[PDB]
Structure formats: C-alpha cells, structure tokens
Design an enzyme around this catalytic site. Structure first.
Site, PDB file in Angstrom:
ATOM      1  N   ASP A  59       0.834  -1.252   0.000  1.00 19.61           N
ATOM      2  CA  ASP A  59       0.000   0.000   0.000  1.00 19.61           C
ATOM      3  C   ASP A  59       0.863   1.296   0.000  1.00 19.61           C
ATOM      4  O   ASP A  59       0.328   2.389   0.188  1.00 19.61           O
ATOM      5  CB  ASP A  59      -0.939  -0.074   1.213  1.00 19.61           C
ATOM      6  CG  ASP A  59      -0.192   0.001   2.542  1.00 19.61           C
ATOM      7  OD1 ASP A  59       1.023  -0.151   2.532  1.00 19.61           O
ATOM      8  OD2 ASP A  59      -0.846   0.229   3.577  1.00 19.61           O
ATOM      9  N   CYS A 113       4.723  -0.398   3.288  1.00 20.24           N
ATOM     10  CA  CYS A 113       5.163  -1.736   3.645  1.00 20.24           C
ATOM     11  C   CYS A 113       6.554  -1.729   4.328  1.00 20.24           C
ATOM     12  O   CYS A 113       6.794  -2.587   5.217  1.00 20.24           O
ATOM     13  CB  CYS A 113       5.067  -2.685   2.451  1.00 20.24           C
ATOM     14  SG  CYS A 113       6.437  -2.586   1.276  1.00 20.24           S
ATOM     15  N   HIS A 170       8.640  -3.943  -3.153  1.00 19.04           N
ATOM     16  CA  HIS A 170       7.815  -4.448  -2.039  1.00 19.04           C
ATOM     17  C   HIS A 170       8.729  -5.152  -1.013  1.00 19.04           C
ATOM     18  O   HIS A 170       9.642  -5.858  -1.388  1.00 19.04           O
ATOM     19  CB  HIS A 170       6.694  -5.310  -2.618  1.00 19.04           C
ATOM     20  CG  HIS A 170       5.730  -5.872  -1.624  1.00 19.04           C
ATOM     21  ND1 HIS A 170       5.383  -7.215  -1.622  1.00 19.04           N
ATOM     22  CD2 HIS A 170       4.993  -5.299  -0.656  1.00 19.04           C
ATOM     23  CE1 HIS A 170       4.517  -7.444  -0.656  1.00 19.04           C
ATOM     24  NE2 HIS A 170       4.296  -6.286  -0.018  1.00 19.04           N
TER      25      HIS A 170
END
Ligand SMILES: *CC(=O)NCC#Cc1cccc(C(F)(F)F)c1
Length: 225
Positions: free
Chosen positions: A43, A46, A219
C-alpha cells in the site's frame, strides 16, 4: 491478517512468478539461508510496517533489550520537537507507538502483537509515528545526509514530499535514517529479474541484524533465518 500475514514456507512464493527462470533460481537459493516468510500489504507503507512488526517481534521475552528500547522511545518526542514538530500534532502517533512497546513488555505474545499490526487504525498510527521520526532524524542531521548521501539534494523538500506523507515509497536514505533513529540493525535481501547474484546490504554495515527483509518489485516482506 490483511496487513501482515501468517508465517509461510519460503518456497510458497514460487507461485508468485511461475515459469520465470531467474525468480525461481533466486528463491531456491534464498530457501537455503531462510526458512519462512510473512507477507505485507503493498500500500506504499510496507517498509515502515514490516520493520516495526519484525523488530518488536524480535524483542519478545528479552527483558534487558525491551528496557533499553523503551528508554530510547521515551526520548523520541525530543527529536520531533528539535526538528520543529509540535507536541499536540504528534501526540496521538507517539502514544500509539509507546502503547505497542508496553504490549511487548506486559503481554509478550506473537498473537497480541500481530492483532495490533493488523488493526488498520493502530497500525496506521504506528506507521505515521515512524514516518515523523524518520523525517525529524534526517532534518536534525541535514549536513550528514548531504555529506554522505548527496551534496546536491534539498533536505526539507525531500522530507515533506517523500517521508512524512502516508503511502510514499522509501529509498536507502529513509532505511538508514530510521535504523539510526531507533538503533535497529537490519539486512535487506535483493531479488530482481536480472541474471545476477542474489545479494544483500546490512544497515549499519558492521552490525549483526535483528531484522531480515526481502525486497522484490518495490515491495518488502519479512524473512526468518
Ligand atoms: C512497500 C510497499 O508498500 N510497496 C508497494 C508494493 C507492492 C507490491 C509489489 C508487488 C506485488 C505486490 C503484492 F501483489 F501486493 F504482493 C505488492
């Protein structure tokens, strides 16, 4: 468990890049050194969310290490004030972080800690605190970030646009700064799609890490040795 997952076997992430020779190679190599992974919600928050959860998880049941960390956290309002943040504007965020640190001390269970980090309200208050502390630490040491990172960058504008706001992505500067601000040693494993060596970086370079993260496709996920 929509923000931070249950633990899974490292090889369970093969399914995320099927029929991709380089991903498969690097994940198999990773599985020789790490046994498990927890996934985070992608989002824009992270890094902060993963570092917060994994560091506090590593403290569980360690009474001297918890006492020392609590002593540092109690001083962090001073860092915020010295960088020009106002108490009445950071109060709600500081109180949420101090509360989860007391939970580590008083309750001491993985299950309790995972519930707070999956509570959208508590978890997002914790992330916003970590972002404000990151910004303060950088601003208070602007010459260090210019000397060692980038003589040409505009520090105030950087913290305003790329640190403080929710959902803004991190680079090496934010990782270095939050590591230093809380004395958290971490190692990041890099998995990209080039035919290169699986490789890592330790923050700071000479340390024994508390936290291991996997960086792939912008990520960060949590690894277990
Ligand atoms: C730290 C962070 O929030 N990054 C944003 C993202 C992402 C992302 C990349 C690749 C795959 C995912 C999935 F599918 F969410 F795992 C998220």
């Amino acid at each position: 468990f929509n923000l931070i997952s249950e633990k899974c076997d490292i090889l369970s992430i093969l399914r995320d890049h099927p029929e991709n020779r380089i991903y498969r190679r690097k994940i198999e190599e990773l599985s020789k050194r790490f046994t498990a992974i927890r996934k985070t919600k992608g989002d824009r928050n992270c890094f902060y969310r993963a570092l917060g959860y994994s560091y506090l998880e590593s403290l569980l049941g360690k009474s001297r290490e918890i006492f020392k960390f609590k002593e540092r956290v109690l001083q962090t309002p001073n860092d915020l004030l010295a960088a020009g943040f106002e108490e009445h504007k950071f109060r709600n965020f500081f109180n949420a972080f101090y509360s989860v640190v007391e939970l580590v001390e008083k309750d001491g269970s993985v299950s309790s800690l995972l519930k707070v980090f999956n509570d959208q309200s508590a978890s997002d208050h914790i992330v916003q605190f970590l972002r404000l502390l990151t910004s303060a630490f950088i601003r208070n040491r602007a010459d260090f970030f210019r000397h060692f990172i980038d003589e040409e960058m505009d520090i105030k504008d950087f913290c305003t646009h790329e640190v403080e706001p929710m959902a803004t992505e991190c680079d090496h500067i934010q990782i270095t700064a939050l590591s230093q601000a809380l004395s958290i040693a971490l190692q990041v494993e890099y998995v990209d799609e080039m035919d290169t060596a699986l490789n890592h970086h330790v923050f700071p370079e000479a340390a024994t890490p508390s936290v291991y993260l996997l960086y792939k496709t912008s990520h960060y996920n949590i690894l277990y040795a």
